[PDB]
Design a protein around this ligand. Structure first.
Ligand SMILES: CCOP(=O)(COc1ccc(C[C@H](NC(=O)O[C@H]2CO[C@H]3OCC[C@H]32)[C@H](O)CN(CC(C)C)S(=O)(=O)c2ccc(OC)cc2)cc1)OCC
Lengths: 99, 99
């Protein structure tokens, strides 16, 4: 798809059999998802943004289906105010900015 | 130009005769710039992100030259950890996400 930016660029994503909406976010290095139940081991980590920092659980090698296209990468989970798909996953769906 | 997302999508911007770099940010509703001196009148606002909230000065109808192309819009100034070009200005440069 080509998508304009008059509205927030949400896509449907499926992760561990769960559906949610996530923002395609070229300003985000990392993918961050809202409180969800994901199986396995994780690495404690903190991410920084506007407003300061937030504690997250880091999960590696997680299968994410973004608009049906499958990608695998690191997903951080925590009290984010929006599900964000960051550049680590965007590069795998061949995402480009055109302007 | 078409830009891939293996590195952060920084572009040069010129605002009130000053040059800086700023992240083309599809996840940002608004444009936020680091502490710089703009003239003249403004309205107090707070913006929210990962980690909570940040107090900003809202300046309306500011001319921004992004990769040389001129746009006019609202610029928020304050203690942001990166200059961010948001969708309010990205729409005016004809910016699209392609995946
Ligand atoms: C405190 C010092 O820490 P820092 O790591 C963070 O420097 C940032 C901060 C924010 C952004 C844009 C937002 N990205 C972001 O948080 O990404 C996180 C996760 O990946 C990492 O990549 C860099 C920051 C991490 C995102 O693009 C837009 N919103 C976030 C979310 C709501 C989608 S926002 O900036 O909070 C926002 C913008 C405009 C608004 O007007 C209404 C409202 C809100 C980029 C870089 O410094 C790095 C040198």
């Amino acid at each position: 798809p080509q998508i304009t930016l008059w509205q927030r660029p949400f896509v449907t994503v499926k992760i561990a059999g769960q559906l949610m909406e996530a923002l395609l976010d070229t300003g985000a290095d990392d993918t961050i998802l809202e409180e969800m139940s994901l199986p396995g081991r994780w690495t404690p980590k903190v991410v920084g943004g506007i407003g300061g920092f937030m504690k997250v659980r880091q999960y590696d090698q997680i299968l994410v289906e973004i608009c049906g296209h499958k990608v695998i990468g690191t997903v951080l989970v925590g009290p984010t105010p929006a599900n964000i798909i960051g550049r680590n996953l965007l590069t795998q769906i061949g995402c480009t900015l055109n302007f």
